[PDB]
Design an enzyme around this catalytic site. Sequence first.
Site, short mmCIF file in Angstrom:
data_model
loop_
_atom_site.label_atom_id
_atom_site.label_comp_id
_atom_site.label_asym_id
_atom_site.label_seq_id
_atom_site.Cartn_x
_atom_site.Cartn_y
_atom_site.Cartn_z
N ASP A 1 -30.22 2.50 -35.50
CA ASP A 1 -29.98 2.38 -34.06
C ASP A 1 -31.06 1.54 -33.40
O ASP A 1 -31.54 0.56 -33.99
CB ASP A 1 -29.92 3.78 -33.44
CG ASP A 1 -29.00 3.85 -32.24
OD1 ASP A 1 -28.94 2.86 -31.47
OD2 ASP A 1 -28.34 4.89 -32.07
N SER B 1 -21.00 7.66 -30.05
CA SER B 1 -22.35 7.56 -30.59
C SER B 1 -23.10 8.88 -30.50
O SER B 1 -24.13 9.04 -31.15
CB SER B 1 -23.14 6.48 -29.86
OG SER B 1 -22.81 6.45 -28.48
N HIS C 1 -31.45 5.25 -26.84
CA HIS C 1 -30.23 5.59 -27.57
C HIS C 1 -30.55 6.13 -28.96
O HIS C 1 -30.07 7.20 -29.35
CB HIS C 1 -29.33 4.36 -27.66
CG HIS C 1 -27.90 4.68 -27.97
ND1 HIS C 1 -27.46 4.99 -29.24
CD2 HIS C 1 -26.81 4.73 -27.17
CE1 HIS C 1 -26.16 5.22 -29.21
NE2 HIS C 1 -25.74 5.07 -27.97
N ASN D 1 -15.91 3.72 -28.24
CA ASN D 1 -15.64 4.26 -26.91
C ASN D 1 -14.69 3.36 -26.12
O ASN D 1 -14.88 3.14 -24.93
CB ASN D 1 -16.94 4.44 -26.13
CG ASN D 1 -17.99 5.16 -26.92
OD1 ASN D 1 -17.75 6.23 -27.48
ND2 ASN D 1 -19.16 4.55 -27.02
#
Length: 279
Positions: free
Chosen positions: A39, A224, A69, A161
């Site tokens: 990430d 996520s 994130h 998403n």
Amino acid sequence: AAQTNAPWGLARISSTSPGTSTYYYDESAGQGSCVYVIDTGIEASHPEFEGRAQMVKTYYYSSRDGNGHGTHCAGTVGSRTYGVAKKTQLFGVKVLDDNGSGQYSTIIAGMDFVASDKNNRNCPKGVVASLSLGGGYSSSVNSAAARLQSSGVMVAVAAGNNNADARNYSPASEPSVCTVGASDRYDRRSSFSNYGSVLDIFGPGTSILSTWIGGSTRSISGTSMATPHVAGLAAYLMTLGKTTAASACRYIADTANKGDLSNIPFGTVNLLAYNNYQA
């Protein structure tokens, strides 16, 4: 073990019903396993990680998470309060910049890094990779994920998403890995969650409270956020000896809560991650 006033996502994965707030789990807690968080990086100094997290690779000028994130996903994998596997080891691989964006070639190199770097780590219970990222379809990004799964790493990726079919998204459309959708605390499919036949499992994804950069916490939504729930669960089930890296996604699907989710489109499996723990 029992964690009172846990985040709703942790309580859900150990429950046959929604609406509870106590996370139950075997106290092994993923000890002896390793989860890679591919990430924006991990703020390892966050006290929630208790020194179990570390950065092993970055493709940018720094290995620090300047986004939040990657720290949030790693907190969902194995932080002491917001984590599924509270005793696993977390290895950060920074393939996304501090804006959350990254080229496919860098993401491809990061997956091949994990394929080799696990031989430099002590993970007698097995190795997991958590990919809370995604973009348009790419057979090279897909094949990099298949290579990662083929080497004996449980790969969990986000479905996406887009509220669309995950078939047009990589590495979400790679069939050999575990593609994870997002649900909310009322057992509804998250309004943003991707779907389709390629999806293997659903996980808590809407309003997920976890660690953030600056030693803080916050609640965000996304597939996520559902991916680290499944990845942490895989490292949890592997430490227990219940499955292996090649059969964890299949095992998670076999033991999932069945038919409990709403607004699941026709053709998409109605499976919700469930640790099957009996206290």
